[PDB]
Amino acid sequence: ASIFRCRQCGQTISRRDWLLPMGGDHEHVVFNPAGMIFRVWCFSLAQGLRLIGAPSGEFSWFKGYDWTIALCGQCGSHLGWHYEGGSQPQTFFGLIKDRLAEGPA
Ligand SMILES: O=C1CC[C@H](N2C(=O)c3ccccc3C2=O)C(=O)N1
Ligand SMILES: [Zn+2]
């Protein structure tokens, strides 16, 4: 089965069935302009989230997709981002592995 929760509150965010092989792997190692290296896991579906701010294509790690920040809908923890703007798929979620916790139903 297997699902992914907000590590700060237990909120259910997504699950393994929903991983999306972007580029060929669901996991991307990236860094940002702050010099922080995350591991980002890509889902085609997520629930339990609140999106914040405007879509933005600056700094995007993924070609043709703008991002908006995704917060845990329950606790406000920054779980990662929602991506929109592209084709096959149009939108998807890029979530910071470290901020989730993977366990069972
Ligand atoms: O696709 C993305 C999501 C946004 C993400 N991001 C951050 O992790 C960051 C940290 C500090 C300043 C600016 C940003 C930025 O745009 C980033 O670098 N790429
Ligand atoms: Zn939470």
Residue numbers in the entry: 19 to 123
Which sentences did the original study use to describe this structure?
Ito et al. showed that cereblon associates with damaged DNA binding protein 1 (DDB1) to act as a substrate receptor for the DDB1/cullin4 E3 ubiquitin ligase complex. In mammals, cereblon has a LON domain and a C-terminal thalidomide binding domain. Architecturally, the thalidomide binding domain is a member of the β-tent fold, which consists of two antiparallel beta sheets that are oriented at an approximately right angle and pinned together at the top via a structural zinc ion.
In addition to the orthorhombic and the high-resolution trigonal crystal form, we obtained a hexagonal crystal form in a co-crystallization screen with thalidomide; we solved the structure of this third crystal form by molecular replacement, locating four monomers in the ASU. Surprisingly, only two of them are in the known thalidomide-bound conformation—the other two form an intertwined dimer and have no thalidomide bound. The two monomers of this dimer, depicted blue and pink in Fig 3, are in grossly different conformations: The blue monomer adopts an overall conformation comparable to the thalidomide-bound state but has the β3-β4 hairpin shifted in position. In contrast, the conformation of the pink monomer is very different. Consequently, as also Y83 is not in place to anchor the second to the third region, the third flexible region is actually found in two alternative conformations, both different from the thalidomide-bound state. Intriguingly, the W79 side chain of the pink monomer reaches over to the binding site of the blue monomer to complete the aromatic cage. At the later stages of refinement, electron density of unknown origin became apparent within this cage, which was convincingly modeled as a DMSO molecule from the thalidomide stock solution.
